[PDB]
């Protein structure tokens, strides 16, 4: 199909990969740091989602350098993915409006 849809699909799949890789890598980075809570995989996956969506409740977060770098990648991938879907939606509406005119 068209580019904007392919990119949206690709961005979504990629986002899911980053959430999975990020959850695993966050636990690896945080264990060994006294006080870290982002240390078991199930809640790390939850953490990765609320990070990618930019909600950031504060129930979980990284305290180490690498856990934070992993977090930054998760944030940017999430913002970029949703931004790209918005961009695809705009392309869709714009194309249609041209049609409604000619």
């Amino acid at each position, epitope marked *: 199909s068209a580019l904007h849809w392919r990119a949206a699909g690709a961005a979504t799949v990629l986002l899911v990969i980053v959430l999975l890789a990020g959850s695993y890598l966050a636990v690896l980075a945080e264990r060994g740091a006294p*006080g870290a*809570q982002l240390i078991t*995989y199930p809640r790390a996956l939850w953490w990765s989602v609320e990070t990618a969506t930019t909600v950031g409740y504060g129930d979980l977060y990284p305290v180490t350098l690498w856990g934070r770098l992993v977090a930054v990648v998760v944030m940017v991938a999430g913002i970029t993915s949703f931004g790209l879907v918005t961009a695809a939606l705009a392309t869709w509406f714009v194309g249609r409006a041209q049609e409604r005119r000619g």
Partner: antibody, heavy 118, light 106 residues
Framework: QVQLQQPGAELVKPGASVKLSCKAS????????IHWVKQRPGHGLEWIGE????????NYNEKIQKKATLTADKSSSTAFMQLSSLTSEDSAVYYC???????????WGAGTTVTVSS | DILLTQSPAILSVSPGERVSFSCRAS??????IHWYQQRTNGSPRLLIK???ESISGIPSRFSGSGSGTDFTLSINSVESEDIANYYC?????????FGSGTKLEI
């Protein structure tokens, strides 16, 4: 079948070192962590450290004099704990346990009785 | 690091009576507490995970409760095979820590 295999015992002369093993069978995931716990006679369970075989990173109890060094051999599904320069304080049963990255020790090894004596 | 307190260290109960072991965390750990049983010369055995979740193979008699800083492991109608040491363990913060243990006496 026995998920975690540990030798029954190890005799070590004071000052020397010994390498304990923990052979795992059963389901194995890249996300499994192998933990080591020390228990002196008549006392409780003391957490020593952990290692993730798929990556090889290890963490240790910082609160106690560091006597251990953890390694893992992926091909033989065996985890190792190197204890060096031991004293009578190091004599105890050392258990290895498997954690699926979800916080609890689902299964434990039989433990290796380590004795420091001349 | 989280200090897990188990008091009393020894509990004497009569047969068939309900018993409760206490485990207190130095700070709130949600429900990230797990219980293990260790009989004489035996290895530890998981009884309850995340405060109250059942483990297959463990008798219905065992149950757990609590959240925050205070947790309880209970046994409905104790029998001889329950004679052992009981430990709590937390996985809320790194590093994992163990309670000091409680001995069950009948």
């Amino acid at each position: 079948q026995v998920q975690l295999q540990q030798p029954g015992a190890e005799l070590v002369k004071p000052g020397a070192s010994v390498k304990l093993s923990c052979k795992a069978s059963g389901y194995t995931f890249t996300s499994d962590w192998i933990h080591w716990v020390k228990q002196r006679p008549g006392h409780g369970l003391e957490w020593i450290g952990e290692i993730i075989p798929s990556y090889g990173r290890a963490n240790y109890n910082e609160k106690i004099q560091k006597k251990a060094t953890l390694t893992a051999d992926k091909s033989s599904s065996t985890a190792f704990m190197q204890l060096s320069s031991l004293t009578s304080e190091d004599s105890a049963v050392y258990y290895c346990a498997r954690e699926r990255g979800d916080g609890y020790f689902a299964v434990w090894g039989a433990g290796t009785t380590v004795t420091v004596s001349s | 690091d989280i200090l897990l307190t188990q008091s009393p260290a020894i509990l004497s109960v009569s047969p068939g009576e309900r018993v409760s072991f206490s485990c207190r965390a130095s700070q709130s750990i949600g429900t990230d507490i797990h219980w293990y049983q260790q009989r004489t010369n035996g290895s530890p055995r998981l009884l309850i995970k995340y405060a109250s979740e059942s483990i297959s193979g463990i008798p219905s008699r065992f149950s757990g409760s609590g959240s925050g800083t205070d947790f309880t492991l209970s046994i409905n109608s104790v029998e001889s095979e329950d004679i052992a040491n009981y430990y709590c363990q937390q996985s809320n913060r790194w590093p994992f820590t163990f309670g000091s243990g409680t001995k069950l006496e009948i």
